[PDB]
Design a binder for these strands. Structure first.
Ligand SMILES: [Mg+2]
Ligand SMILES: [Sr+2]
Length: 119
RNA sequence: CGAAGCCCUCACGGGCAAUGUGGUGUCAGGGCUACCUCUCAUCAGCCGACCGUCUUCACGAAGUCUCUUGGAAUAGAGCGU
C-alpha cells in the first residue's frame, strides 16, 4: 500500500503469474525478498515481482525505488501465496525475480511495456 | 550459497520454513576470486574412571586369678597379660 503507486488489473496479473510458471520450468527464477534484492543490485534481474499483502511493509518497501535506479521493471501481485505457488513453492513469497527468462522473453517484454503505460 | 533443513508419528501422514529452515562465518576478521600447504585447533557426539573426600559396615589382641575391705571391686596389697 505505501510502496504501491499504481493498481495492476486482474487480467495483467494473470498474464504475469503464467509467465512466471514457465520461467521456472525453462529459464531460472529467484524466490524470496533477499534473493530478489541481490538480483536487482547485481543486474541479473529481468522482471521482479512484489506482493501487496506483505505485513510488515518494510520487507518489500525498497523494491519500487531500487528497481527505478537500476532500470529493472516491477509488477504488483495482490496475494503472497499466489506468487509462491507460481515460483514453485508450498509456502508463499513476498517477492520473486526472473533471472533471465526462457521461452517467455516475448511475454515478459510485453508485461514490462504494459506496466510503463500504467505509470 | 538458497530448500540442500527442522518438529511430530512405528508408519502412513501431518506441521514448520523464501518475512529464509539449512550450509558457510564470527578480529589469529570473515566472504568471494587465484593459488600453497595442511589438519589433530575448534564444534558436535560416543565411551567413561583411578585417587581422594564424606558416611556406613565386616574383622579385631590380652585376667574377670589370690588376700583384705565392701551391699557390690572398677579399691588396697600380691601375681599375670
Ligand atoms: Mg555454522
Ligand atoms: Sr506465509
Amino acid at each position: 500500500p505505501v510502496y504501491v503507486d499504481f493498481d495492476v488489473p486482474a487480467d495483467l496479473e494473470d498474464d504475469a503469474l503464467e509467465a512466471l510458471e514457465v520461467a521456472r520450468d525453462t529459464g531460472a527464477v529467484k524466490k524470496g525478498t533477499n534473493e530478489t534484492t541481490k538480483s536487482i543490485e547485481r543486474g541479473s534481474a529481468e522482471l521482479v515481482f512484489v506482493a501487496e499483502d506483505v505485513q510488515p511493509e518494510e520487507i518489500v518497501m525498497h523494491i519500487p525505488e531500487l528497481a527505478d535506479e537500476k532500470g529493472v521493471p516491477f509488477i504488483f501481485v495482490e496475494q503472497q501465496d499466489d506468487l509462491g505457488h507460481a515460483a514453485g513453492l508450498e509456502v508463499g513469497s513476498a517477492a520473486a525475480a526472473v533471472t533471465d527468462a526462457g521461452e517467455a522473453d516475448a511475454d515478459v517484454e510485453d508485461i514490462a511495456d504494459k506496466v510503463e503505460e500504467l505509470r
